[PDB]
mmCIF file of C-alpha atoms (C1' of nucleotides) in Angstrom:
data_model
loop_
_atom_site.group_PDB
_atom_site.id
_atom_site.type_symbol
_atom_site.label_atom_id
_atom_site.label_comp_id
_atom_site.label_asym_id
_atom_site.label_seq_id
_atom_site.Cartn_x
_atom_site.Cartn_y
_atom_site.Cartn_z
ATOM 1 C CA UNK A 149 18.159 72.617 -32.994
ATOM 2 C CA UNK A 150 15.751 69.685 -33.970
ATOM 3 C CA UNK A 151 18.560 67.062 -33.788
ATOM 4 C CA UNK A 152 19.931 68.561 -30.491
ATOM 5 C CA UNK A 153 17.050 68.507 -29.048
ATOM 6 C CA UNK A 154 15.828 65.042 -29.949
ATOM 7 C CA UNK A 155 19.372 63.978 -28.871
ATOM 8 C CA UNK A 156 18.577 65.465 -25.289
ATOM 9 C CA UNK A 157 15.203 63.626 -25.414
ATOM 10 C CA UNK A 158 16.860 60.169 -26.150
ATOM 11 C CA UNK A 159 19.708 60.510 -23.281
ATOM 12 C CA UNK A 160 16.797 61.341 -20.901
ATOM 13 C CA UNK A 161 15.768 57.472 -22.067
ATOM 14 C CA UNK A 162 16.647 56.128 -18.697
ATOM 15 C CA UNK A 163 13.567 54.223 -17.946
ATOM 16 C CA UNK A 164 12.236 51.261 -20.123
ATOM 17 C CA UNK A 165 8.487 51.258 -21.484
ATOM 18 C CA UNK A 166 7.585 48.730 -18.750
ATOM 19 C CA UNK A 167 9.321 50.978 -16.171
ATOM 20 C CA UNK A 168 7.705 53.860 -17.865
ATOM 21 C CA UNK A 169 3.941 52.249 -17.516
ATOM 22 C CA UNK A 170 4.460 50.992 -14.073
ATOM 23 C CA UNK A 171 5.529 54.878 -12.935
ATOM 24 C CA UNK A 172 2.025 55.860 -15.296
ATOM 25 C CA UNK A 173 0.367 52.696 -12.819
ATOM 26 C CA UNK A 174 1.305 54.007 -9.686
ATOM 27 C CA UNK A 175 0.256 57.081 -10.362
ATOM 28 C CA UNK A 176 -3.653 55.810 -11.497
ATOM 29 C CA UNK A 177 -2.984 54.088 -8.153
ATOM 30 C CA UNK A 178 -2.563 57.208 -6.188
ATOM 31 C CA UNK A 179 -5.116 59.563 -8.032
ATOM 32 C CA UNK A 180 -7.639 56.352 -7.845
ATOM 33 C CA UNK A 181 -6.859 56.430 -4.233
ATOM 34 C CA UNK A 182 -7.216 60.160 -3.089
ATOM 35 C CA UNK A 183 -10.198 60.121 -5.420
ATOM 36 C CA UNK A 184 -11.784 57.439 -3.341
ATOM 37 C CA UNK A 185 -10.753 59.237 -0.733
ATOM 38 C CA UNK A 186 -11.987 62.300 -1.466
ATOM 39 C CA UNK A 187 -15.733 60.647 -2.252
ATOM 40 C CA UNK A 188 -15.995 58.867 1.270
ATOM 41 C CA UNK A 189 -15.029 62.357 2.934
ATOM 42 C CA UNK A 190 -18.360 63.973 1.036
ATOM 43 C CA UNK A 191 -20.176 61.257 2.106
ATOM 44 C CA UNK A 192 -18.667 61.262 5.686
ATOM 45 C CA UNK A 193 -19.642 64.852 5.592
ATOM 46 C CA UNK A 194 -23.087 64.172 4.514
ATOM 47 C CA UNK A 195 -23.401 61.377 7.022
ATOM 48 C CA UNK A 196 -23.557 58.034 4.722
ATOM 49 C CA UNK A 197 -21.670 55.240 6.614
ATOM 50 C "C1'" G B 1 -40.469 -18.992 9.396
ATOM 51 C "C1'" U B 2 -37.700 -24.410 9.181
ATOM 52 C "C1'" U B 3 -36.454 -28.288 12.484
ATOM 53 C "C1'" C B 4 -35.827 -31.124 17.354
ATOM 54 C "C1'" G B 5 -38.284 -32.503 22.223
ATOM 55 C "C1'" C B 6 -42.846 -32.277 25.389
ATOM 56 C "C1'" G B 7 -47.876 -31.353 26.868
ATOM 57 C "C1'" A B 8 -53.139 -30.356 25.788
ATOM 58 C "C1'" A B 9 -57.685 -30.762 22.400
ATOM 59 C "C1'" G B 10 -60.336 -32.743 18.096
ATOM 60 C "C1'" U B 11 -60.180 -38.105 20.239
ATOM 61 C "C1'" A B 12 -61.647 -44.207 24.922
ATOM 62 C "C1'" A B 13 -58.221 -42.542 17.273
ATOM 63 C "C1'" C B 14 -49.651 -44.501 17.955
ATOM 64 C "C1'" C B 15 -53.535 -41.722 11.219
ATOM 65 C "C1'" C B 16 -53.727 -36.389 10.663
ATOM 66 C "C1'" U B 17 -54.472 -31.367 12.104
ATOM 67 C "C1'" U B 18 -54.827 -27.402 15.767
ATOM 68 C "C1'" C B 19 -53.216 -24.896 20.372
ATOM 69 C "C1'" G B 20 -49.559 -24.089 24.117
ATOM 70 C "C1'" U B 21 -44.398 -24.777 25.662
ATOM 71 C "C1'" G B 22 -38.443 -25.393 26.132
ATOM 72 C "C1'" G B 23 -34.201 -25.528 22.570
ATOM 73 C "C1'" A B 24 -31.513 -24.841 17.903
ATOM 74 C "C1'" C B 25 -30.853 -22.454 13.048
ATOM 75 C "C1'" A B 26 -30.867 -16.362 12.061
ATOM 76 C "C1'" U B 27 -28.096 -11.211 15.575
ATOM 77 C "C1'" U B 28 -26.780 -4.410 15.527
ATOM 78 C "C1'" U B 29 -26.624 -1.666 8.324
ATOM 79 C "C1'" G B 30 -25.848 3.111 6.607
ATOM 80 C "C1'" G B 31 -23.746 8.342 6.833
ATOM 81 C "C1'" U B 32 -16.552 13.223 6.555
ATOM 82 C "C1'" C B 33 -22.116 13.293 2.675
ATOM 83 C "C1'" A B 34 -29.685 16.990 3.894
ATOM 84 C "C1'" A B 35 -33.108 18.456 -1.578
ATOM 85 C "C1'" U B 36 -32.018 25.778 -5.580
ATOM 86 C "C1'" U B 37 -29.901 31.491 -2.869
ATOM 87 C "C1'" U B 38 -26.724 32.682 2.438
ATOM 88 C "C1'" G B 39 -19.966 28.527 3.091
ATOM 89 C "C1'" A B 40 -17.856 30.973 -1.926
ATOM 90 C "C1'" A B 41 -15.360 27.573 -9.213
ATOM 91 C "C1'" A B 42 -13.986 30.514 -13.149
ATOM 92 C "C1'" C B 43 -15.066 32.349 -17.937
ATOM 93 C "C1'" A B 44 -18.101 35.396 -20.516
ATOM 94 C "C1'" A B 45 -21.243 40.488 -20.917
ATOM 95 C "C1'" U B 46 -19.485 46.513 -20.986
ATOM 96 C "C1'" A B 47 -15.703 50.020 -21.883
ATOM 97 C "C1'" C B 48 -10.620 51.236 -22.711
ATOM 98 C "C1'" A B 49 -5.838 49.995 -23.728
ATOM 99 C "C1'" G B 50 -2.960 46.688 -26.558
ATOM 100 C "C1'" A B 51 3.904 43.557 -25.023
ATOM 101 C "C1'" G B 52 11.141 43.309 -22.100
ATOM 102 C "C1'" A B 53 15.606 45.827 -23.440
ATOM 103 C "C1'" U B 54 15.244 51.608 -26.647
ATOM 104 C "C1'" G B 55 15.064 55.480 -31.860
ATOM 105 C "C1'" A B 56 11.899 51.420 -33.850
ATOM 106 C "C1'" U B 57 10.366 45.838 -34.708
ATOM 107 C "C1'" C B 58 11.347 41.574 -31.972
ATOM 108 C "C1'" A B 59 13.631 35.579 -30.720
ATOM 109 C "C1'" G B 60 14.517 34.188 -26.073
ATOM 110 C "C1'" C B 61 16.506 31.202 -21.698
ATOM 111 C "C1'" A B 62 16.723 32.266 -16.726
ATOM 112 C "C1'" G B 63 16.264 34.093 -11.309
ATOM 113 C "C1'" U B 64 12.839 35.774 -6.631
ATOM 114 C "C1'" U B 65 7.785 35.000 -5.240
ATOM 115 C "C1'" C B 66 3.521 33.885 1.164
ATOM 116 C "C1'" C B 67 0.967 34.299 -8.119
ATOM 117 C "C1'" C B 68 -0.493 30.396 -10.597
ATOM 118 C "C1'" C B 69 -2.847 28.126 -15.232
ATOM 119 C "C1'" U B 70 -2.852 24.411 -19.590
ATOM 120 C "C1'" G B 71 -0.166 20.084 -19.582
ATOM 121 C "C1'" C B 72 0.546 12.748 -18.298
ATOM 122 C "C1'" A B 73 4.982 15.212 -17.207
ATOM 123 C "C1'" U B 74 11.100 16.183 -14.098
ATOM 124 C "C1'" A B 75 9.240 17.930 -21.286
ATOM 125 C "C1'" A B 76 6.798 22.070 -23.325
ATOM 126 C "C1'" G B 77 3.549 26.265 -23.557
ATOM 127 C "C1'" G B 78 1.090 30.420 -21.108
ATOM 128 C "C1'" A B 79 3.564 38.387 -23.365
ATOM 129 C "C1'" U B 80 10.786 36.454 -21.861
ATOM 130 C "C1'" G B 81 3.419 33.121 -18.060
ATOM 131 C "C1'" A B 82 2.065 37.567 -14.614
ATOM 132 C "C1'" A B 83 4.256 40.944 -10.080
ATOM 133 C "C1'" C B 84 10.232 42.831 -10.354
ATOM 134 C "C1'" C B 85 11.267 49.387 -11.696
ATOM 135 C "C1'" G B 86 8.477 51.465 -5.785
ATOM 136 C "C1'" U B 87 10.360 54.229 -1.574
ATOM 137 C "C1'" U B 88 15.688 54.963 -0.045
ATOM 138 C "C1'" U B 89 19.274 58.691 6.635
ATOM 139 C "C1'" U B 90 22.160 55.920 12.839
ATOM 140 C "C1'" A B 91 27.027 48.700 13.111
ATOM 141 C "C1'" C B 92 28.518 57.089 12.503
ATOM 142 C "C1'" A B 93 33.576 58.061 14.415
ATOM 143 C "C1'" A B 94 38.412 60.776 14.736
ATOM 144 C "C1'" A B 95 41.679 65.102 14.331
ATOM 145 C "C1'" G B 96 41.902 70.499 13.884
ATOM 146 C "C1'" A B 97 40.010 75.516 13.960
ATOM 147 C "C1'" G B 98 37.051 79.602 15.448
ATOM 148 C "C1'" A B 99 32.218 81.814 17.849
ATOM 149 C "C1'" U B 100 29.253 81.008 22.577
ATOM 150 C "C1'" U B 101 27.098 79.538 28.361
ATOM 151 C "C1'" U B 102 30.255 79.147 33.235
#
RNA sequence: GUUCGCGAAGUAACCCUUCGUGGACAUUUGGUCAAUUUGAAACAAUACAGAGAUGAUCAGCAGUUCCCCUGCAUAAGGAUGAACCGUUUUACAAAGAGAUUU
């Protein structure tokens, strides 16, 4: 069970670590983003230009 | 200011000096530029991570670029110098069959 599963871990490998950190990137990107987002709408709300 | 020419005074003085006059010598610099913020250097300070193949540890050389840096450099180095991976729909048809509006 432990090698057969490790086994299906390693041919999930399609992605290099570079690959791997640039998907982990974009994705600080986009929760950066709607964060931001998210901060200028409660100030929108509140009336701060 | 220097010199050349002339006149007038000292001065009935061809010496000298003064005053006045015409000429000549001499003729248009420097600034793309103003002396602390507000016409732009970048590093460093904080904090966290801490490298390209994949199971690990790595040597690289390249390519694209509306990224450059150090380099005297057309050498070399900068993590293989860095970003590369992300989305992903129509030069769009033809034949055949049935179920529907008239």
């Amino acid at each position: 069970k432990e090698m057969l599963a490790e086994a299906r871990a390693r041919l999930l490998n399609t992605q290099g670590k570079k690959a791997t950190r640039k998907i982990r990137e974009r994705m600080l990107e986009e929760s950066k983003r709607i964060a931001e987002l998210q901060k200028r709408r409660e100030l929108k709300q509140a009336g701060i230009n």
